[PDB]
């Protein structure tokens, strides 16, 4: 069973520049002069899309900035020039010998200028309160780069329990990232305190960005 190893595992490139990614096969994928190595693009929440078939050939409907070369056990995909819409995971596949098998994929990320997050905080909905729960939600949208820290505080005091975080993949329009952070407590405990605050800390700024919600109004 043929094994495909892709390099690198991730790659970061600026808009307009060149990106190349490799695939090594454990044995040859050649036959009849043709090479049976294909490349696919998968964007988040979408199925894989065929880009290049048989090592060289561009699938119809695909921009000419994509190209492939190689033979035998060594193959490359080139993207030049890179665009915002090319954020994706790329996979190589061989069809020479059943079973067909896939490389572990290569993540293409874009470099761009630093951007500070827009932060929004949301109190509990009253429909949630009726059921005995209380979540406070904080969105931190459209920042670069990806690394970021979020801290919750109740009446000055930090909380780490009942906090759930989630991060988007890089955006394909503006190349930014986003995050949400949720804090869940009981209605009972929620009603005992007044001040709920999310504090974001990010490369963009030496000071933390604070958004706050007060039950006094």
């Amino acid at each position: 069973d043929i094994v495909l190893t892709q390099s690198p595992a991730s790659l970061a490139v600026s808009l307009g520049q060149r990106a190349t990614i490799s695939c090594r096969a454990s044995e040859s994928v050649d036959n009849y002069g043709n090479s049976f190595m294909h490349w696919y693009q998968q964007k988040p929440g979408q199925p894989p899309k065929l880009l290049i078939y048989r090592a060289s050939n561009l699938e119809s409907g695909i921009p000419v900035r994509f190209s492939g070369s190689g033979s035998r056990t060594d193959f490359t995909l080139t993207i030049n020039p890179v665009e915002a819409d090319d954020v994706a995971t790329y996979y190589c596949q061989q069809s020479n010998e059943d079973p067909r098998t896939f490389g572990g994929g290569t993540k293409l990320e874009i470099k761009r200028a630093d951007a500070a997050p827009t932060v929004s905080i949301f109190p509990p909905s009253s429909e949630q309160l009726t059921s005995g729960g209380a979540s406070v939600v904080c969105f931190l949208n459209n920042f670069y780069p990806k690394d970021i820290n979020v801290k919750w505080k109740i009446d000055g005091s930090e909380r780490q329990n009942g906090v759930l975080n989630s991060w988007t993949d890089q955006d394909s329009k503006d190349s930014t990232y986003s995050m949400s952070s949720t804090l869940t407590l009981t209605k009972d405990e929620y009603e005992r305190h007044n001040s709920y605050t999310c504090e974001a800390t990010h490369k963009t700024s030496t000071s933390p960005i604070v958004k706050s919600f007060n039950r006094n109004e």
């Binding site: 009849y32 899309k49 078939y53 995971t89 909905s125």
Partner: protein, 222 residues
Amino acid sequence: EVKLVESGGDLVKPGGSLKLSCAASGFSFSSHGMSWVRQTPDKRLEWVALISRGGSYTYYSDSVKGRFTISRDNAKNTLYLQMSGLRSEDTAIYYCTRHKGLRRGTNAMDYWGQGTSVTVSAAKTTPPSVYPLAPGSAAQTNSMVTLGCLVKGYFPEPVTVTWNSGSLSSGVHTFPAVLQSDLYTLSSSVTVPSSTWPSETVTCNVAHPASSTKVDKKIVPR
């Protein structure tokens, strides 16, 4: 237009069975090899099974051999995957793929369905609770305003979220689901200009096939 529409995906208990379907249209079904391919939650792609144009020849990956059976009805433009003896390994998104019809050897998969989700678990289906997220009463209106929607306490994945039934597509972030105490939670935000809300109406639409749930939550100020 070429289409492949998978269906049949559901929550199944371990040792259980399931049949997936792919309805093809817009091209000659019987001139093309077909495959099933799955994507596991760590995002590896794994080819599962293939079937020849005629349906005479089939081949299967080692992990599914003797448990899964691929078949086609060329009269109905339908591809099938019969799964039995299901394990946790088998939890994935299953895609139906069409092979290219080129001569001189084996082919790439030039078209893929959107995929159908299959979860193998002893746990019970739970419908989501959906909560509106409207800005706090003391907050400041500065051109743009962000609203959102919290979808909490459901099983299994997936849920689908849209805003104004699709009319709102940009300035939307829908965050991947996160599991806690064996229940998923996600959220979605949407950003619009301050004039448009609360004048016009903003509603999140949430669907959870596995519990036959569909909720439309209007975002109202406080």
